[PDB]
Amino acid sequence: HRIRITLTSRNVKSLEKVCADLIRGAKEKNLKVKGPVRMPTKTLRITTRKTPCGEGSKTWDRFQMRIHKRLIDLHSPSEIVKQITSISIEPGVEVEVTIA
Amino acid sequence: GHQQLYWSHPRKFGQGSRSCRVCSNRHGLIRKYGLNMCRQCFRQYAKDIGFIKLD
């Protein structure tokens, strides 16, 4: 009954659109919803030399890859969540539904 | 036998064990976050993986 949706995405606006649709999907069906908890975004970092050889001035590229995690708690029966979460997802976002 | 000598020297550790998953070469390996992918390959495929230059 306490069902915990984990929205993890690389993009923010796709993740904010999905978590906004899951608040509208929880408000229209009138089930009690703990708000989307913004988790601390993880910046995956790789700093390589630019040069494929060793013969320039030592320039470095610094590749970030931000991963944003939200999570939403619902007071909802199982099959109601199975219907909600299966509708209108966009491929940037990864959705993991925890039953209990 | 030859089968007792061909691959009998250990490949359990060191930069003679793991190799680039594209180049197949043994140098400048990005082992971080299980890329297992040499630094020139990563620099080619960064965009395709989701790595972006911002700051």
Binding site: T8, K42, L44, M65, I67 | Y33, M37, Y45, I49, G50
Partner: peptide
């Protein structure tokens, strides 16, 4: 997944697949 890979590794593994 039964091995249960890290979320840092999962999104990088998703990229390597696409590459």
């Amino acid at each position: 997944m039964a091995v249960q890979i890290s979320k840092k590794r999962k999104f990088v593994a998703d990229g390597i697949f696409k590459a």
